[PDB]
From a paper:
Therefore, to study the binding of 14-3-3θ to the pT340/pT360 and pT340/pS366 pairs, we determined five crystal structures, allowing for direct comparisons of the structures of singly- vs. doubly-phosphorylated complexes. All the singly-phosphorylated peptides, except Site 1 (pS325), bound 14-3-3θ with ~1:1 stoichiometry (i.e., two peptides per 14-3-3θ dimer) and relatively low affinities (Kd ranging from 5.5 to 16.5 μM). For the singly-phosphorylated peptides, the electron density is symmetric for the two pockets of 14-3-3θ, even when two-fold symmetry was not imposed during refinement. Specifically, the Site 2 and Site 3 peptides contain a proline residue at the second position after the phosphorylation site, producing a characteristic 90° bend of the polypeptide chain, which as a result exits the 14-3-3-binding groove, thus leaving a significant portion of the groove unoccupied. Although the sequences surrounding pT340 and pT360 are closely related to each other, they are distinguishable by the presence of two large side chains in the Site 1 peptide, Y337, and R344, occupied by smaller side chains in the Site 2 peptide, E357, and S365, respectively. A previous report linked IRSp53 phosphorylation at T340 and T360 to the binding of 14-3-336.
The I-BAR domain protein IRSp53 is a key player in these processes, acting as a hub that integrates signaling cues from Rho-GTPases and phosphorylation pathways to initiate cytoskeleton and membrane remodeling events. In the inactive state, the SH3 domain binds intramolecularly to the CRIB-PR domain, resulting in a compact, closed conformation. Here, we show that phosphorylation of two pairs of sites within this region triggers the binding of 14-3-3 to IRSp53, which inhibits membrane binding and the interactions of Cdc42 with the CRIB-PR domain and cytoskeletal effectors with the SH3 domain. In all the structures, the phosphate group on the phosphorylated side chain engages a cluster of basic residues in 14-3-3θ, consisting of K49, R56, and R127, and additionally forms a hydrogen bond with the hydroxyl group of Y128.
Residue numbers in the entry:
A (entry chain D), D (entry chain C): 356 to 365
B (entry chain B), C (entry chain A): 1 to 230
Write the structure that this text describes.
């Protein structure tokens, strides 16, 4: 589980 | 090519997941010298995020393999050289982006939204450089990332409602900077939680065009908080 | 480079999902002039499948957008030129693969397992060329794909067992060739169904390892069958 | 839906 950032790579 | 066709091509490349072409289009648009709209800024952001993300993931995999390899093993040098190749590609992408940000985007921004967006991007790509840096170079890169984030964070607190997607995205990425780069989980949680709470207190007044974006970011803020507190 | 080092690098690229690098490595290996082991043969297959797969996906997306675009829309030309760029890249990759199969892999194969695998690969990449071809070009590429598949099919039925993964994979891709390229669902179903039934008959004669390998492909066969019979 | 072929891109 990674920390979520934006934008997100597809 | 003209701006209208560049945007056109960039959206095609996005749909086709050809992010190299996409970033090339948005770099050309940027270098034409005109301010980017909200749509165009997000296309620039998405393009280079996917371009750099492939290198970030590759670098992590290779670095993890390098660290599991015995220092006596003769194949270690091949792993190290490969890591440095991907690292060099990653630094080149980050440098290109930071050069666009300082040469064109931040310089010509006429509204606080644009300035906060670009300064957030600046914190992001200094942060990606910090992930692969060591020693004093790492410290200075961390300072440059924090400086950009902090400037955008003050401008957003002074010029934007807590439900604005750009201010929320800034909180999300800045809190992650606190958690992964500064290694301060308590301040990261407080930063994410604060932006989350301030957005909830105002959610009822949000515009329906920003529901989907603001709420999406709020979902991510909450997911990070749930992970960091468990 | 050294073959041993090229293969290490290729396994590293695979882990990092750097399939361009992985393909370049395995092409260099193939150019060393020696027969590939089962491991190296699988590395070459995975590498070029991922490299071409990105173009097949992009071509599909762009083609779908083109189809639903009004024929009088002045934005259609750009969509068409971009589709042609993707086609050009796809043809380059397939040509590179078929050239390797023609000048090294098929020529120097000294066992039926490898011969079936490489001829299967030859049909696969003529099939990818046919997916995007038109007119007589499409006719010849289809003929070449069919020819390769057919020889792989004869050899696999003569030299290998119905539970061998390579033979089941050949049946899988060859049946798809009948369904999508020749538009003959009846023959496609018969081919997949025959290979599937002939396999379950001899599932008794396998350890849980080969049983797992064969059963995994047989599930893909029955998936296509379920999809096609609806 | 789509037709399954091997190997499959990750
Ligand atoms: Mg992260």
């Amino acid at each position: 589980t990674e920390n979520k950032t934006l934008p997100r790579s597809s | 090519m003209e701006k209208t066709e560049l945007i056109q091509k960039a959206k095609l490349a996005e749909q086709a997941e050809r992010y190299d072409d996409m970033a090339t289009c948005m770099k050309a648009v940027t270098e034409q010298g005109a301010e980017l709209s909200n749509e165009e800024r997000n296309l620039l952001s998405v393009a280079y995020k996917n371009v750099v993300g492939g290198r970030r993931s590759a670098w992590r995999v290779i670095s993890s393999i390098e660290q599991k390899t015995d220092t006596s093993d003769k194949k270690l040098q091949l792993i190290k050289d490969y890591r440095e190749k991907v690292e060099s590609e990653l630094r080149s992408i980050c440098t290109t982006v930071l050069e666009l940000l300082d040469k064109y985007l931040i310089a010509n921004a006429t509204n606080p939204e644009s300035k906060v967006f670009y300064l957030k991007m600046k914190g992001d790509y200094f942060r990606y450089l910090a992930e692969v840096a060591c020693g004093d170079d790492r410290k200075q890169t961390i300072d440059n990332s924090q400086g950009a984030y902090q400037e955008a964070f003050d401008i957003s607190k002074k010029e934007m409602q807590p439900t604005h997607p750009i201010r929320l995205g800034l909180a999300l990425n800045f809190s992650v900077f606190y958690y992964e780069i500064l290694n301060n989980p308590e301040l990261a949680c407080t930063l994410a939680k604060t932006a989350f709470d301030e957005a909830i207190a105002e959610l009822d007044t949000l515009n329906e065009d920003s529901y989907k974006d603001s709420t999406l970011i709020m979902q991510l803020l909450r997911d990070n908080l749930t992970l960091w507190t468990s």
